[PDB]
């Protein structure tokens, strides 16, 4: 599921990861979190807010 960061974000949590406005992630599932995805970047998978990205499945 093609992910696209709409804004500049930095991880808050330890299970979360950073992305800059424009990174293309890889949304490797979602479960219960109806506000957070579990996508991939920079060889690290982590939580990212659904409100900070524009998805395209």
């Amino acid at each position: 599921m093609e992910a696209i960061a709409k804004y500049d974000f930095k991880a808050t949590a330890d299970d979360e990861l950073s992305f800059k406005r424009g990174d293309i992630l890889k949304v490797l599932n979602e479960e219960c979190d109806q506000n957070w995805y579990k996508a991939e970047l920079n060889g690290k998978d982590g939580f990212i807010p659904k409100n900070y990205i524009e998805m395209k499945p």
Binding site: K6, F9, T12, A13, D15, N35, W36, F47, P49, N51
Partner: peptide, 10 residues
């Protein structure tokens, strides 16, 4: 001015 991040509980 990016959005207010959701209150998570992961």
């Amino acid at each position: 001015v990016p959005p207010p991040v959701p209150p998570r509980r992961r």
